[PDB]
Every structure is written in structure tokens, then in C-alpha cells.
Amino acid sequence: LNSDLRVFMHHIYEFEKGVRSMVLATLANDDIPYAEERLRSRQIPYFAQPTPNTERTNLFFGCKECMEAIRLFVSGRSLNSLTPEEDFIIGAMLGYDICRQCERYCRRKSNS
């Protein structure tokens, strides 16, 4: 079990205790089968998004409702190409403080 994976497992423990409603883990393509097996053993919903120009995959996991949501606007897009609104909602799903998210939304709207 490599470093990326030891860290993924830690995220699983936190999701189970209900720290947050969604997690994003970036892993090597080769480590994705194993990561997904660990999620399936626990019945934790997930959505994998391969990154076109790498051998790395964004593995989202969390409540089913947010898996269904991230598919409707993250599918086939880059995460750095999200609107300030889409970014707010990603951060909120990830468990970020809302006032914090309100601040970076304003910053996106102002800093441009």
C-alpha cells in the first residue's frame, strides 16, 4: 500500500464518521481498482473521473445524492474550468465552511 493509498484510507475513515458528505482523492490509474474495492466493501457511493492527459484519476466518494450531482456538471470537464458558482458548490459538498465559500465566491467575482 503506497502513500497516496495510505492517505485515501484515512479519508474513508473520516467519511464513515460523517466529517463530510463528499471526498475527492486523486490516485494513480493503477491504484483505482483497489480504492474502488475498499469503497464497495463499505457500500460507499463513488464516481471516478480519469484525467485525460495523465495516468491519474479523480475519485469522488460520498453520499449518493452528491455523486448524482457531480455527474451532471463535472462529467468530461476540467475542475479548474468550473464557474465561481460551480466551485462554491464543490467546496460546500467537500465540507468547507460556508462563510469561507462566500468569501472565495466574492473573491472570484471581484478578483476578475
Q: Using CB under 8 A as the criterion, which residues of the chain lie in contact with its own copies when the complex forms?
A: 2-3, 6-7, 10, 14, 17-22, 62-63, 65-66, 68-69, 72-73, 83, 85-86, 88-89, 91-103, 105-106, 109
- Residues 32-38: contacts with CB under 8 Å, at least 24 apart: 32/57, 32/59, 34/5, 35/5, 35/8, 35/59, 38/8, 38/9, 38/12
How far apart are CB 107 and its own copies at their closest, in Å? 10
Closer to its own copies by Cβ: residue 77 or 109:
109
- Residue appearing with cell numbers 479523480: 58
How far apart are CB 33 and its own copies at their closest, in Å? 20
Closer to its own copies by Cβ: residue 20 or 38:
20
